[PDB]
Amino acid sequence: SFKDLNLTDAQKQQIREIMKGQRDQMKRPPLEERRAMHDIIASDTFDKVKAEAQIAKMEEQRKANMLAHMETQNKIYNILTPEQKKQFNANFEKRLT
Amino acid sequence: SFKDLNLTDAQKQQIREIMKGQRDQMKRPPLEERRAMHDIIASDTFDKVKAEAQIAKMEEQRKANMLAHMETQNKIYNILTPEQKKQFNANFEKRLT
Ligand SMILES: [Cl-]
Ligand SMILES: [Cl-]
Ligand SMILES: [Cl-]
Ligand SMILES: [Cl-]
Ligand SMILES: [Cl-]
Ligand SMILES: [Cl-]
Ligand SMILES: [Cl-]
Ligand SMILES: [Mg+2]
Ligand SMILES: [Zn+2]
Ligand SMILES: [Zn+2]
Ligand SMILES: [Zn+2]
Ligand SMILES: [Zn+2]
Ligand SMILES: [Zn+2]
Ligand SMILES: [Zn+2]
Ligand SMILES: [Zn+2]
Ligand SMILES: [Zn+2]
Ligand SMILES: [Zn+2]
Ligand SMILES: [Zn+2]
Ligand SMILES: [Zn+2]
Ligand SMILES: [Zn+2]
Ligand SMILES: [Zn+2]
Fold it and tell me: Is the terminal CB of chain A with fewer CB neighbours within 10 Å at N or C?
């Protein structure tokens, strides 16, 4: 939640420039992934080998998405003032998502 | 100047580290050059050969100073974002030193 940091107008513009500078922006849990999960779950046995293959399948896409996310967050962190960084870091310590 | 350069606090710290890292590094003794220049000017006749020797001595100090200056500016340039580099380059066109 960047919005509780009292972002300056300059910082709001800088965030826009960062988010345009790293926009993917991917959709919400691909239907294909869900359908593969569905096939594993709605079966009379749990197929662990099949499940492992399903879990691994989008590893490349996850890597690209998570790299973009982390780089974006790092860029935003670095436009913050020392006061804002302390608040961001305190908030980080309390959340688990 | 740094005119319209939106420096991150991380980059402002990096600049301080660069500028401290050049202000200490090599020696600066310039009063001797100035005193030799003074003695050429405040003399009953102009000694061209002596003046040429003073100028050549000054080239040593100029080299040291210019190398330090350019290296410092290069280090600063390389902490900048692409947007900031474009602004730095535009500003460079308007400044004289
Ligand atoms: Cl489904
Ligand atoms: Cl069956
Ligand atoms: Cl069966
Ligand atoms: Cl793989
Ligand atoms: Cl943490
Ligand atoms: Cl310069
Ligand atoms: Cl300069
Ligand atoms: Mg060096
Ligand atoms: Zn900007
Ligand atoms: Zn389904
Ligand atoms: Zn199915
Ligand atoms: Zn069966
Ligand atoms: Zn296993
Ligand atoms: Zn793998
Ligand atoms: Zn993200
Ligand atoms: Zn995150
Ligand atoms: Zn932490
Ligand atoms: Zn005299
Ligand atoms: Zn002479
Ligand atoms: Zn300089
Ligand atoms: Zn300069």
Answer: C
Domain positions in chain B are: 1-97
DSSP letter, residue A30: -
Residue A68 tokens read as: 């973009």
- Closest CA of chain A from B95, distance in Å: 25
Question: Could you tell me the resolution of this structure in angstroms?
Answer: 1.8
Please indicate the experimental technique that yielded this structure.
Answer: X-ray
Yes or no: domain B1-97 corresponds to CATH 2.60.450.10: no
Terminal-residue alpha carbon distance, chain B: 10
Q: Check CB contact of B6 with chain A, cutoff 8 Å.
A: yes
Cα angle B95, B74, A71 (rounded to 5 degrees) comes to 115
Q: Provide the token pair at A35.
A: 């359908």
Contact A78 B6 (CB under 8 A): no
Cβ atoms of residues B40 and B51 within 8 Å = yes
Residue A9 Rama label (left phi>0; alpha psi -120 to 50; beta)? alpha
